[PDB]
Design a protein around this ligand. Structure first.
Ligand SMILES: O=C(O)CCC(=O)C(=O)O
Ligand code: NI
Ligand SMILES: [Zn+2]
Ligand SMILES: [Zn+2]
Length: 472
């Protein structure tokens, strides 16, 4: 009946001055104790661009064009073949012609293309989902390119809140990656129209996401605190099963997949089960941040262009760990080299003791403790596993490991410190598997690849072990 739409509590909205703006990771660390309780927050930029998004796309790039995907409005009404077809049924557009198409579609629905009040279009979207006749909507996700100006005078484009600079920021955990990952080491452009949506979900590897709106109509977000994630999933599993949420029967599988088979469902279903939901209505010039493991969904109120990138800081490491477990449980290759990030950050902290002790913030210090704790646990397990491996006598070979991260052939967990290699190089395994029970077609000789500086890292671990707050 849609009363809920305007009784939904709104997420925190921050309005820093220029001098407080700093870089987004430092700023997030200052506001984290409050904002992280909500899962989502909004930050009004105190910096305006000099060259607006359309002028960047038309003047600072050559013949910018993009291809859309076709998104069904009611996901559960379609089988798995129709979804494939939908993805590739898009069309190539200029920025301008996509704008005009969206405006003419909007005007055909509402007799005028003028932006309508936020409450009106929110109710319109949910009533369309529930009983509308529009089948699909066109949008351009995951487009590569940026609308931040590269011009030197641009206050926004030359700031650290230019999302192309985020992943290399000093507090960005993923600054340590040597490989590129779209959406993760680089932002991506999103171009939407009326009712184009992002269904309920959590980022890969439980990363943060930060999203800037460059221009166009409002964008409504619903966010779930990270602390409610499990509850969210529990409730969704019940409501899909009672057919409170429309989908195809789950037939087990994994929540990540079942979610992909549900028609987007309104926050009232979750409110009725006492999981908190907070609303953000984002307009050009505002950033929206979602926190690790914070479920979020939303939709566009008309033509709009935004830009997003995912990231991590120290405080993310406990969440990454949980994600790695799920990745391993589902037998899926993780997105990030978790072990390698732990070890690199930890050795950086072990290397310097005076930059960190003197001026640290609480969230930064907690992230440092999370890194040190993850590192200590990793080194301990590896030490015990190596001791057992040695005593068994089933791994005669030993090689100094100078590779990057490798993927385990059985559980697909990332291996940075150590792996057990086979006689043919195609069946390496992490150190969690019983060597005696490996039946490999290449033979039975097993070689431990062990990172060259393992002793330095054990010493760093033993020293972190004794520090206050590193409690294991
Ligand atoms: O821009 C969008 O529509 C997707 C936003 C999102 O899912 C994110 O930034 O995490
Ligand atoms: Ni997202
Ligand atoms: Zn494994
Ligand atoms: Zn082999």
């Amino acid at each position: 009946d849609l009363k809920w739409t305007e009784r939904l509590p709104e997420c925190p909205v921050y309005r820093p001055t220029k001098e407080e703006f700093e870089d987004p990771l430092t700023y997030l660390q200052k506001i984290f104790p409050e904002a992280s309780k909500y899962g989502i927050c909004k930050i009004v930029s105190p910096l305006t661009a000099t060259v607006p998004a359309g002028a960047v796309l038309m003047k600072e790039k050559s013949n910018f064009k993009f291809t859309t995907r076709v998104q069904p409005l009611r996901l559960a009404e379609w089988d798995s073949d129709d979804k494939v077809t939908f993805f590739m049924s898009g069309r190539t557009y200029t920025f301008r012609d996509y704008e005009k198409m969206a405006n003419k579609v909007f005007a055909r629905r509402y007799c005028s293309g003028g932006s309508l009040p936020d409450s009106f279009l929110e109710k319109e979207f949910w009533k369309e989902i529930a009983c509308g006749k529009t089948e699909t909507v066109e949008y351009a996700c995951d487009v590569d390119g940026s609308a931040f100006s590269s011009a030197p005078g641009d206050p926004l484009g030359s700031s650290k809140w230019n999302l192309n600079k985020v992943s290399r920021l000093p507090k960005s955990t993923l600054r340590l990656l040597e490989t590129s990952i779209p959406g993760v080491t680089e932002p991506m452009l999103y171009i939407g129209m009326l009712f184009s949506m992002f269904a309920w979900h959590v980022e890969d590897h439980y990363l943060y996401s930060i999203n800037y709106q460059h221009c166009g109509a409002s964008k409504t977000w619903y966010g779930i605190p990270g602390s409610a994630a499990l509850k969210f999933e529990k409730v969704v599993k019940e409501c899909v099963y009672n057919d409170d949420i429309l989908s195809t029967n789950g037939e087990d599988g994994a929540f990540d997949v079942l979610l992909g088979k549900t028609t987007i469902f309104p926050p009232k279903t979750l409110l009725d089960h006492n999981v908190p939901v907070y609303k953000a209505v984002q307009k050009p010039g505002e950033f929206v941040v979602t926190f690790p493991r914070a479920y979020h969904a939303g939709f566009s109120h008309g033509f709009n262009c935004g830009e997003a990138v995912n990231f991590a800081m120290g405080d993310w490491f406990p969440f990454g760990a949980i994600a790695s477990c799920r990745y391993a449980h589902l037998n899926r290759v993780p997105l990030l080299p978790h072990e390698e990030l732990i070890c690199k950050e930890a050795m950086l902290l072990n290397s310097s003791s005076k930059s960190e002790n003197l001026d640290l913030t609480p969230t930064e210090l907690s992230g440092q403790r999370s890194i040190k704790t993850a590192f200590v646990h990793l080194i301990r397990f590896l030490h015990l596993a190596r001791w057992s491996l040695m005593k068994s006598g089933l791994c005669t070979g030993l090689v100094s490991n100078t590779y990057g991260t490798i993927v385990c052939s059985l559980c697909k967990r990332d291996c940075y410190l150590a792996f057990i290699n086979c006689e043919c190089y195609s069946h390496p395994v992490c150190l969690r598997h019983d060597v005696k029970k490996l039946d490999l077609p290449c033979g039975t000789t097993h070689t431990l690849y062990l990172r060259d500086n393992i002793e330095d890292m054990e010493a760093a671990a033993m020293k972190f072990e004794k520090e206050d707050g590193v409690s294991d």
